[model samples]
Structures are given as structure tokens and as C-alpha cells.
Target: DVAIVKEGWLHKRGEYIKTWRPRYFLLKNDGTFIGYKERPQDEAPLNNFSVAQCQLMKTERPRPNTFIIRCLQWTTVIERTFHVETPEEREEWTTAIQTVADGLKRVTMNEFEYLKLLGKGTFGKVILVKEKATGRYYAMKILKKEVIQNSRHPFLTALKYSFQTHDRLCFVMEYANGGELFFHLSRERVFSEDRARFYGAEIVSALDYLHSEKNVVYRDLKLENLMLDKDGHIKITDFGLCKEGIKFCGTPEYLAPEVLEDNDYGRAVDWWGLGVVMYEMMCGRLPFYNQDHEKLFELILMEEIRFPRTLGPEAKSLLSGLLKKDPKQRLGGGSEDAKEIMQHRFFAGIVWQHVYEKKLSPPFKPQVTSETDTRYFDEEFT
Candidate 1:
């Protein structure tokens, strides 16, 4: 009896009938293939061959919700087809089979090595990992999967791959490497209005996607959590504080009044953060900053917003709408939400579609020498 490594049901659409017919196949322990037109134990498999002798490839232009599994016989080179779910499912099966075909190719902990400690937080730390096979760098965040698994995110730095060990999970993610937006802001101190507006437009684009498409509220919206890609566009990170539904948690400076008051809040909180961040970028100082936490919360809760005399009327108007204490009257407060802010006068000249496509030029061009540069990160963390 041949032991099975993986066995699954696949449907084959025949020459005459244009419908899927079920077939059970086996990936034998010895790295061979066995197929049965009917059940295997009833008699014997209709097709039995070594997978090593048969090359498997994907058929071109396959239909959605289905993928073609093309197998070419080693001797005759005759191609046959079987249908599986999606391209994603095929990759899962193919990768597992490739492991048995050539043990040389695999991804394990040994496949990556940490180059440096980028930052540490309460729950986890983000380290830069270099893949041995591809030599590409990825930011690996090791955290309790229970912490972040509840909500899916739309951040540009999507998860590349991940695995679990014990109670925690390790996520191999897209490496931004352009460093935190705060790092750059701390050095530059201030940005030109055009540059500030560019950043503002990008943030609106990203936060809107999360709010509208994903139903996520990014509670903590500070310069530190915001990241830049090599191309100098925004890549918002740190989903630890992100949650669905309203919650009373976030940085004191960026916290919306509703959030600080422990009231039910929603997407409008993100707009508040956006306004605060834009002001910080333009003025080089937070609008409601205080060293003491109590005083900071009080300011964010009750203080009247004031802008510098040099701040333009349009810029001040945009901030007033976003920074409004009453969530009902916030910039993105209405049913239209992000669209209202997207069409605001401050961003009147911005081609929002290009911003969404990341076509707009980044005002700051980061000097990314290689994949592993850390000069822009905090020296303390480095």
C-alpha cells in the first residue's frame, strides 16, 4: 500500500462535455502521482505515474474560480488537464509538491536572518530579515497572532508570508526601508506647503481605503507609525492599535475628542489624525502637544484650535473641518465620508485618482542605497 502525502478532489472537463467531472488524485509518499477515474479502493487507479517524470504547468487564460493543472507525460509529452479552485490554491499544492520533488528548495526559519533591530514596542518588535533564496529584504513582525488576526488590513506593505510557532505568529512583510515619516520630519523640521499637501493627499487616500473598503479605524495616526517607501510615497504601518468599531485608545496628540471622551466613534477619528498630522508637517510642531499626558488629553478634549498667522486660509479651513471636536461635523463626517474630504477645496487641484494609483510625485526622494539601509532609522534603535 502506498502512503499518501496529499490527496484531494479535482474536477476535469473532458473533450466532449464542457462541465467539470470529479476525480480523486493522490500525491504518494514516494513523490509519484496516482489518479482514479472512480474511487481508488474500488479497483485500481486509472492513471499511475511518477510525478518526477510528469512536468506540471498552468494552462493559459483559465477561467476564474478555477485553474488548469496541466501535466505533460515524460515519454510522449502528451499534455492532460485537471481543474482546481484558484491560482492561489494551485500555488499551495504546487509548493508542497515541490518540497517533495526537490528537497533543496524550502522556506524555514533558516531561510532568513535578522540584519538589525528596527524598533521595539509593547507587544512585539520589527526586525529586518533577508531571504537566503532571493536575497530580498522583508520586515518580519513577530507578534501574538491573536492580536492582529481579527481584522484584515489594506496597508501597502501587505503580508508577504508568515508561519506560526507555539502561541505567537511571525509575519514576513514587505519592507518599506524608507524609514519612518517621523525620522525625516524630525530632521527637516518642516515641509513646504506643496510637500505637506502631497503627504496629506496620500494619507487621505490610504486612510479612506481602510475606512471605506476594510471597515478599519487606525486609532494611532502619528508621524512615528507612518512610513515611506523607497519611492518616497506613504506606507502606513503599525496595525497594533488599529481596530474595527470604536475604541478609546490612541496617542494623546492625535486622539479625537470622541475617543478621549470614551464615546462611540468611527471613521471620523482617522480624519482627526489626518488633520493633526498635516498641521504637524506644515508647522513642524503639533497643534495640541503637551509633555504631560493629562494636560495633553485635556487640550485634545477641550482646547480651541488655533493656526499661525502665516498659515493660509485654505490650509486652515481644511484643518478646521478635520480637527472639529464634534465628529458629526468633521470633514469626513457625513454619509459620503472620504469623498467629502477628497473633494475639499484644500485638495481642489489634487488629481485624487493619480494619488490613489500612486502616480503623484513624492515631494521628498529618499536615498535608498540598497535594501538594507538603516541610516534613516533612530540611532537609539539601531
Candidate 2:
């Protein structure tokens, strides 16, 4: 006759306490209580026992002369290990990890099998791609779908205007293997005066073409969006905030007061930015520097010209004319006046036509190859 021994009810080892409670519980095969323990280690050999009866059966011992029971205890353990000692070290590690993650997220293999990372933005990144068969390189601007969906109307409008003005001189270059001028300037402590002058001239010329010829307004003009070719010639880029006809555009530091006031603005804004860029190239600082944006705007509106001692009369005159509040009076008259401004003593030895034609050598040469060769870029840029 077969008989069954039903296990009696079991209870917790200790009374319940507000601060302490059972940590481990066990059950019998017949659904009866098998008691609870404070910790797994409190249990004997059963501490390692399987939660399922089928698993327990798989561990059954074969018949022997005698079976010796050995108690095995299991306990939970938490591990904590770190390679860095200081908070600074951890912060650096975190920053590096983020940068590498961003780079990896943007890097892609192009048709030429060449890996490139053209540019990085909040939403997406641009890359320079080469065709494997033709050895042709092209700039590829990538915009994330999520970013586009979340972008503001002004951003979208600017992008549309940029695309419409694609053929204009002020527009972003279609083929740009070279990187931003910001990197170049930061890499070299200072650019030669002649190079700076030439760059300034090109910018003005481009702006003239855009405003006078195309009737388009480029609100933003900064070193961040200007690219340099292998020969160091300038290539305008990034129309994310550009506008058609007349609209308030441009970074606050470079913006003219008239535009900020919602007054009708023309192409004169670019010239103003040119003046700021020229001053920056010479002194490594903006002419108007203030902590408060309103104060800065007020200074731009009413403050007297404060030319740096390093700047010559010609530079001062050029800046004064460009920064003139009156658009009609800005930069004097038309192209003839613009040419005369170029002929100032500051650019005494410069041959404007030669520079534009790429006949004269640029003042500075950049030593760059693939996107990976960005060791010269500013540390904060990443």
C-alpha cells in the first residue's frame, strides 16, 4: 500500500517587525507552506534547492551505502567597482564617451567606401562622401527626421530660402571638402592681415551679389558657417536662419540695431557682419562685448566708435561705414563705392581681382585631410 505524508503548515522564523521582514520564502510540493527565512543563508542545504519540484528531482542522488548531507548556504551580494578616483576624472570620461557616441552616430560609409563626418548639429550631421568608382567627393548634409519634425517654422523657412538661393554666391557651397573657418582660425592663433582682408573682401562681394542681384538677405554671417577650400578660398554655408527679402535675422552679437527693431533691412546686414569679422580678426575680439544682450544692442545703437589702437584709419573707416545705422548711408553708394572701400590703405598691397581669381596665394594654409584630422579644432566645439 502506498502512503503520503502531507507536510504541516509552516510559519516565518521570527515575528514581524516594522523595520525587518522576511527576505526568502519556501513552499512544499503539495502547496503547503515550507516557512520563511531572514536570508537565504539561514537555510541549510535547501538554500541551493531549485524553486521547481522537477528541477529538484533532477538533482536526486543515486542509492548508496549511506548518504551524507552537507549544508550549503547562499547569500545575495552587491558589487561596486570603479576605475576612476576623482569626480573630475568621471566627468572627463563621461564627456569623452558622449563625444565618441556622437561621432559614431554620424559616421557612415559613402559610395566610395570612404568614411566621413562633414558637420555636426543638434539634430543631424553632415558628411563628406567620395565615390569609389569616380573618386568624386561631395558634401552631404543629413537632417534627422525627428529633428525636422520638431523644427520651428523659422528654421524651416530659412532652409527653404537657402535652397531657393542655392546658386547665389552667398549660399552654402554645393561641394565643400574643407571644414569651417572657425576651426582654421582657432587652429592658428591669428591669420595674416592680407588673408583677413582678402576673406573680408570675398564676404562683402558675396553679400553684394546676394542683396543687390538676388534680392535675398542673409541674416547670419559668421566664421562658423564659412568653409575654406584646399587653397584657402572662402565658401559660404549654413542657411538655417537665412531669410528672403527683408526679415530679422543674424546672431545678436553681429546683428545691426535697425534689424533688431523690426525695421526694413537690406543686404547691409552682411556688411555689418563683415566689419565685426574684420575687427575680430585683427583684435581677436568683437568691438562690442557686454554680458547683457540689451546693453550690447544699446551700445551698438548709440555708442561712439571705439577703434582698437591696433587698427589703422582705413580699417576704422570701413567699419564705421559698414556699421552705419542708416541702411541708405551704409557702405556709401553702390558697387563703385564698394570698390573704393576695397581700395583703402588698409588693403594697400592687396589685389582684389587676383585674390578672387585665385591667382594670389592665401595668407594661411590649412593642413587637413579627412574628417578624422580635427585635432586642430577647438576642444569646446565638440
Candidate 3:
């Protein structure tokens, strides 16, 4: 696909159903806006629409992140607006599209070359790239920007350089060679307690950063978004649903009870997600499973989680304190927040200092054939 664009996520309209509903959009040389249901990396288009006839402008004119591209080519064109995240982004998208549309170029660097398709979803596709000048590998997240924006976390594959192609949003990020944690989990089915504990410690550190320093909340926490680097340290990704505040947004099974109740929630919800991650690591199946969505939310709100009989007392105790229905009663609810969870017995062995320095050795090191080998990932998708 073309290299510049933006996506749904981290960019929402005070709504859900998609927590920024990972939609893809791109800019066209003719000033056309293209919207797709799936990422372009999937091979061919899966029913896409173009803004052949659309109006574009910045609301707070001369402001950033406020650019609006109104679609008139839709089934009906009354007035529908798509979003972009920041002021600079909005300016960049509008300018980039205009450049191609009017035929010009005031662009920045695009020295990166697409190497491999890393992963893609409702939002967009992440590709492995090499910076021609720096000679470094970076994860390039390509999205449709004719419209703009998105989210994920720090233990996340951190953003490198972000730019706009004619209509797409592209981000160059630190490459994670070990692949997705869930990919490894799918093969192993489960992890040893130490292995899980190692990951849990690092994840908590990441969540702690988001909650305290950034004043952001991570509603989603699952093995899939966690990727491992060459040294095996994991980083959280996908902030499509994360925001400065919390309400309801995340995978069905990972939803907290308070979220289901529609109460104003804060960082505790992140810990609630952490609890689910801990349970999954130890038990290998979701604590609450359901084929139906509504029923699953109900189960999360009402059911008492039953841990596997084989779980260790420390792990069980930690899980118990975290999965509480009331946010106040959750493990990390106190004034100390993450401190309480960090001090829990399940993670007693993790040395905070060494973990940050990445001195701790991972329990599992994936067999990577080469820097570009994606054998550990899903082949059909990769």
C-alpha cells in the first residue's frame, strides 16, 4: 500500500463500538480520501470507499489536529466528519493531501523502506522498515490519514518518526524481533510462573507509567498487543482505546465490572486488566468465557472468578485482590496504586531495578531464524 495514512483509535468521537473503531483512511494525489474496512496489507481491498467528492478544511482554521474532511460521496452526504489526533497531525494531513491534490511537495523525510508486514487489524498495518540513512530497523505503522490519528502504550513498541505520504499516516517505530507475546502463548498454551511473573512485572511498570506520569488509562491488556524485542523485553502497543480517562473500551473478556456498570473509572481499570493477564498466564483460558458479547459483560459484572486448583497461593491471592468488582477494593486501588501490586507476593521475586535495566533474563527466548524471520508469528497473516 502507499506509505502515508492515519487510522481509527487514539482518535475517537466520544464513543465506543470500536474504541476508535480501527478504520483505515488515506490521502490521494488527486485530493481524494480513501477509507477501507481492512488494512491494505491483507492483499487486496475489502470493499473501500473514496472521497472523490468531499470538502476539506480545518475547523479552528490555522489550528492543528482540527482539520475536517467531510464526505459527500457517501450513501448520503448531509454532514459527517472523521477525526485526526493532534493539531500538528491535522495540519500535516491537510497539507500533505493538498500537496498531492494541487500537485506540490513541502514534505519531510521518507527514507524508510518497507521490509515485512508486521501486523494489521481494524486500524492499520504495521510493517518492518529500514531507515536508508541511519541503517536501522524500525516498525512502520501505516494508516489512512485522509481522515487521521491512534494509541497503544510504552512497554509498547515506541513511536520513532511519524510522517504523511499523499494520504496515508506512517510511523517508524522500534522493531520488536521476538514477535507478539500471544503468538508465543498460542504455541506454548501457557507459561511457567516465573516466565509469567517476569512479564507481569514489566507490564506493571509500563501501566504505572501511563497511569501516574501521563495521566492516561489503558483499557486493553492482552497477550496479543505485547511484543518481545531481541532481548525478550516486552512493550505494550495499541492505544486505540486508551485515553486520559476511562469509561468502557477493551476486549470483551478483559472488561472490568465497573466499566460494565458505566461508572467513572480511573487507573484501577488498568490493574483490573493486569489481573486478567495474570489469570490467563497461569490458567491458559479466560476467567470468564462466552460466545455472546452481552452475556460475557454480564458474567464479568456478576460472576465470582474461580481460579484453577493448581494455581499457587501467591498467584491466586494476587488474582483475588485485583479482580474485585468495586474499584476501591481492587489490589492497586489504594493511594499507593501500583505499589500495592508490586509488593504482592506473586511478584516478590522481581527486582524493580534490574527489570528496568533489562538485567533479568527472560524465561523464554523465541527461536528467531534471522532479524527478518517471522516464523513465530501467524503465517497466513504475516
Number of the top lDDT candidate: 1
Candidate ranking under lDDT, highest first, comes to 1, 3, 2
Q: Model 2: residues >4 Å from true position, as ranges? A: 1-179, 239-250, 332-337, 369-382
Candidate 2 collision pairs = 112-132, 118-126, 118-127, 119-126
TM-score of each: 0.64, 0.52, 0.64
For model 1, how does the per-residue alpha-carbon lDDT over 217-295 read when each residue is reduced to its tens digit?
6666778778887778887765341111222223457778876654445678788989889999888888898888778
Residue 268, candidate 3: Cα error in Å is: 0.7
Shift of residue 75 alpha carbon in model 1, Å: 48
* Candidate 2, 200-256: lDDT as tens digits: 767765665554444445656766667766556677764232111122123467766
Whole-model lDDT per candidate: 0.68, 0.47, 0.64
Measured by TM-score, how close is model 1 to the native structure?
A: 0.64
Number of clashing pairs, model 2?
4
lDDT of 3 by residue, 51-141 (tens): 3344567675333355454442211122223456676766666666555544522325457666777565333566767777665667666
Model 1 RMSD in Å is 19.0
